[PDB]
What does this fold into?
Amino acid sequence: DLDLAKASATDQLKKAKAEAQVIIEQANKRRSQILDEAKAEAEQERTKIVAQ
Amino acid sequence: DLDLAKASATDQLKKAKAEAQVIIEQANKRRSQILDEAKAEAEQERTKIVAQ
It folds into this structure.
């Protein structure tokens, strides 16, 4: 029973770290999409004032 | 010994649980941190383009 508990214990700790990595991956990717959208809109704001 | 080991197997499971939660908690904190740094930077660059 010691070793069978250890099985699920290491499972959960490693799996927690793994999903905690995939969430931070999503974090960075969403940062990149956010920043690219902000920049691509700011450029058309500039172009609006330029055309005015 | 078998009674003591059963009492031991709950502790390892419990700590795997709590530490999985602290790990996922820190990873969610970091996601909510980087996605905020992203906004703080993106708005500055937007203003820099319009100032260009």
Summary: DSSP finds one helix and no strands in chain A. The interface with chain B takes residues 1-2, 4-6, 8-13, 15-17, 19-21, 23-24, 26-28, 30-31, 34-35, 38-39, 41-43, 45-46, 49 of chain A (CB under 8 Å). Helices of chain A lie at 2-51.
